[PDB]
Design a binder for this molecule. Sequence first.
Ligand SMILES: *[C@@H]1O[C@H](CO)[C@@H](O[C@@H]2O[C@H](CO)[C@@H](O)[C@H](O)[C@H]2NC(C)=O)[C@H](O)[C@H]1NC(C)=O
Ligand SMILES: *[C@@H]1O[C@H](CO)[C@@H](O[C@@H]2O[C@H](CO)[C@@H](O)[C@H](O)[C@H]2NC(C)=O)[C@H](O)[C@H]1NC(C)=O
Ligand SMILES: *[C@@H]1O[C@H](CO)[C@@H](O[C@@H]2O[C@H](CO)[C@@H](O)[C@H](O)[C@H]2NC(C)=O)[C@H](O)[C@H]1NC(C)=O
Ligand SMILES: *[C@@H]1O[C@H](CO)[C@@H](O[C@@H]2O[C@H](CO)[C@@H](O)[C@H](O)[C@H]2NC(C)=O)[C@H](O)[C@H]1NC(C)=O
Ligand SMILES: *[C@@H]1O[C@H](CO)[C@@H](O[C@@H]2O[C@H](CO)[C@@H](O)[C@H](O)[C@H]2NC(C)=O)[C@H](O)[C@H]1NC(C)=O
Ligand SMILES: *[C@@H]1O[C@H](CO)[C@@H](O[C@@H]2O[C@H](CO)[C@@H](O)[C@H](O)[C@H]2NC(C)=O)[C@H](O)[C@H]1NC(C)=O
Ligand SMILES: *[C@@H]1O[C@H](CO)[C@@H](O)[C@H](O)[C@H]1NC(C)=O
Ligand SMILES: *[C@@H]1O[C@H](CO)[C@@H](O)[C@H](O)[C@H]1NC(C)=O
Lengths: 66, 419, 198, 49
Amino acid sequence: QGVNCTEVNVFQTRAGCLIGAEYVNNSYECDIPIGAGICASYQTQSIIAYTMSLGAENSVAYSNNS
Amino acid sequence: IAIPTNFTISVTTEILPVSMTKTSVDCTMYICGDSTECSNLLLQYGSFCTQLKRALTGIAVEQDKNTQEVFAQVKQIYKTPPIKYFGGFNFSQILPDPSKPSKRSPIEDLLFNKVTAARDLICAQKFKGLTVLPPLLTDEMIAQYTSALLAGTITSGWTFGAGPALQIPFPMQMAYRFNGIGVTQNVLYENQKLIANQFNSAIGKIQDSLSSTPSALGKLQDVVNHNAQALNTLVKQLSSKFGAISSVLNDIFSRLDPPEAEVQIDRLITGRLQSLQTYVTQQLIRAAEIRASANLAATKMSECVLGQSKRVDFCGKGYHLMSFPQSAPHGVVFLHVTYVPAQEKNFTTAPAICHDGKAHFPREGVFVSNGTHWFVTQRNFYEPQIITTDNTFVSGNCDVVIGIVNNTVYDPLQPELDS
Amino acid sequence: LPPLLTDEMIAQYTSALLAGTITSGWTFGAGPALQIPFPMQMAYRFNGIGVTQNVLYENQKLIANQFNSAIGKIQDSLSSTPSALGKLQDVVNHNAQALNTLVKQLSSKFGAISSVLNDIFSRLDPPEAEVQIDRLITGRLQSLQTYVTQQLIRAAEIRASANLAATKMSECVLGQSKRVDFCGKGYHLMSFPQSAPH
Amino acid sequence: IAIPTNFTISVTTEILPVSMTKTSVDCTMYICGDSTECSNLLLQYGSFC
Ligand SMILES: *[C@@H]1O[C@H](CO)[C@@H](O[C@@H]2O[C@H](CO)[C@@H](O)[C@H](O)[C@H]2NC(C)=O)[C@H](O)[C@H]1NC(C)=O
Ligand SMILES: *[C@@H]1O[C@H](CO)[C@@H](O[C@@H]2O[C@H](CO)[C@@H](O)[C@H](O)[C@H]2NC(C)=O)[C@H](O)[C@H]1NC(C)=O
Ligand SMILES: *[C@@H]1O[C@H](CO)[C@@H](O[C@@H]2O[C@H](CO)[C@@H](O)[C@H](O)[C@H]2NC(C)=O)[C@H](O)[C@H]1NC(C)=O
Ligand SMILES: *[C@@H]1O[C@H](CO)[C@@H](O[C@@H]2O[C@H](CO)[C@@H](O)[C@H](O)[C@H]2NC(C)=O)[C@H](O)[C@H]1NC(C)=O
Ligand SMILES: *[C@@H]1O[C@H](CO)[C@@H](O[C@@H]2O[C@H](CO)[C@@H](O)[C@H](O)[C@H]2NC(C)=O)[C@H](O)[C@H]1NC(C)=O
Ligand SMILES: *[C@@H]1O[C@H](CO)[C@@H](O[C@@H]2O[C@H](CO)[C@@H](O)[C@H](O)[C@H]2NC(C)=O)[C@H](O)[C@H]1NC(C)=O
Ligand SMILES: *[C@@H]1O[C@H](CO)[C@@H](O)[C@H](O)[C@H]1NC(C)=O
Ligand SMILES: *[C@@H]1O[C@H](CO)[C@@H](O)[C@H](O)[C@H]1NC(C)=O
């Protein structure tokens, strides 16, 4: 927690440093909360860390007379 | 009786704190730092540091629960259409600003700016074993939730909070809300331009009012000040004797024999443990108060933003029309848009009308008289009309009600019968 | 310490609220005040609860008599049973009891040989006076901290009760409420406030 | 079905506490009393006041 692990896989996050989790670029609902918008999960026989997804995406067809 | 003949649209602001600052404490390094003698003697005192850590962790998770419960109330993320024409209303002052990299709105920025070699106080506090954990949700996520809520309420109305989102033109939504407060929709369809102008002027006035005065956010600053005061007192508690010869302990071990040093060390341990216990208790009480405030804020968000409320003086001052949420450091700000009457006039009324030997009562409105004639008009607005049988119902003769008058009731069928 | 608002000002506020709700209806709580005859206001409220207007206008005298009889009986009902005002008495008794315990806490020896400073000072040497005074100071600080903690908890409870009372005043008096059992037992018609010690 | 034919107007009483007595305390007066040496020793002890 709150330690720059260059003077301690390694990932330097806002909450400190995480060891043992592989960083991905996807987005899922949070399973285990780590902090600062970062969560972790057990997926794929591996442990991954990712950024939260704030639900799905939607747009509503707005117009003058519909 | 008095009847209004004009109206005004008003916008009011409310500020509610939601969350607190998460903290964690290191027992041993706070109590004695790097002395092995304390590292040994503390152990025989049992384990006071399991329940303290448990309570602090409980408070920390409760803060995240509060924030998530208050803000995360939409299943999907809505977006506004690229064109920003909404029948004359100008929502450009609360919608997200695309130019700024922070993707905030022209007010949220004011709120964030309003609330605020050498060593910082945070570093000095951290060097005593008091650490500050970061919140789970970043400010960008909170802004995203707020923008989604604003887009949903602008585009679909209250339908998106009870099922599938259903689009509707904004003018018709405002007409529905006017019908909800008790005023017919022709008033809106005839005064659209004036209402839009008043809305824009009120939004600009809120802009200026928040911009000029810098003491409208007292509650959040008070919470921050209380937390800082508690931490400062805890830090200052380390430089007192607690009934021993000296506060600093290396001198205690160096100067005297181990026997008396044991008594001094025991006194220091007891004092510091007591101080930590009191700090934890005060933190628990403050957390309970913050949770109550967050529950109130969540209820207000559910009841005023996602719908229209008939509770008096709950979502503003006046007849509620709608509301808009904005974020703020450890809190939320509600902008309530409400409706107020103005320019009232005197009139003379009567409970009923005795015509043709029968008593007649109004169906929805009320009876008035401009000195000579008699009309029926809606309660919250002056709109006189000729008394007919379409907007009046009959029951009993006219010798029971007190205060009746005679007049006549026009039947719109006989003229067609004669021609 | 004395309260900021004297009882006269509170009575003035309650009288103003009564006059406003009697002579204006619910309009004075949402903007400019507009007058209206009282029978017409009762007709509006009857329409609000789901009963047509003519029902009141054809039974004005009976309703007035029933209201007068109820207002007569409530005064007698308040003058017999002493358990009706239990809550305020409980608050006062609890505060007085806490203060009494705090003041009585002084006489305790707290493990020492006496509770009077002058006797220890004029009868015992300073080196042992140090530890005796330390014992007494520790005990009295603990007592004061305990008193402060319970005062904080009780203040939080009182604040919650005051918030509920403010909500009831804003919703049942300045307007008519549709919430069930929130402003009485039945279909809500109206409400009137009165002031009591604390 | 069952339908009412008469009504009754009722008045009900509710009591709610609002405020609580305001108190203040003095450190030295409560703890020491009228002895100055106790005050001199106590001022070395802390700032709980
Ligand atoms: C809804 O009505 C608005 C108002 O006329 C339309 O916005 C206009 O669009 C045209 C073409 O892009 C512009 O030349 C006008 O300047 C716009 N009006 C204003 C006030 O700026 C909008 O296109 C209409 N949308 C639909 C789907 O009919
Ligand atoms: C209700 O109030 C509005 C606002 O004061 C009135 O609109 C004003 O009308 C005058 C013309 O007499 C204009 O000079 C003002 O610029 C208008 N105000 C705004 C904000 O546009 C309106 O006339 C009033 N209604 C009635 C029936 O008197
Ligand atoms: C909606 O309101 C905004 C802000 O009040 C208006 O933006 C102004 O645009 C004019 C250009 O004619 C600038 O001179 C002003 O400086 C802008 N305001 C601010 C605060 O910078 C906008 O024109 C209004 N109308 C629409 C359709 O967006
Ligand atoms: C009360 O209202 C009625 C109708 O709204 C008024 O009656 C008309 O008044 C105008 C005056 O501008 C006359 O030209 C019409 O001939 C009247 N109509 C009828 C059927 O008589 C009446 O004058 C109003 N009373 C007032 C203003 O004191
Ligand atoms: C309304 O009109 C009726 C009839 O024009 C009035 O009833 C008359 O009342 C007088 C005395 O009050 C009697 O002598 C007549 O016999 C009544 N006529 C009828 C046809 O019943 C009634 O008084 C008028 N209303 C008011 C308030 O004066
Ligand atoms: C409805 O209830 C009222 C009162 O609860 C009844 O009024 C009573 O009627 C009797 C018989 O006429 C009188 O002796 C009483 O004095 C009345 N009470 C009062 C307070 O005046 C009434 O009869 C009931 N029924 C109807 C149809 O109204
Ligand atoms: C961690 O240390 C490296 C090397 O000194 C530095 O470049 C980096 O900015 C540091 N990060 C933090 C968050 O302190
Ligand atoms: C209505 O009449 C009363 C009677 O004097 C007067 O005081 C009042 O000002 C009148 N209403 C208005 C809106 O002027």
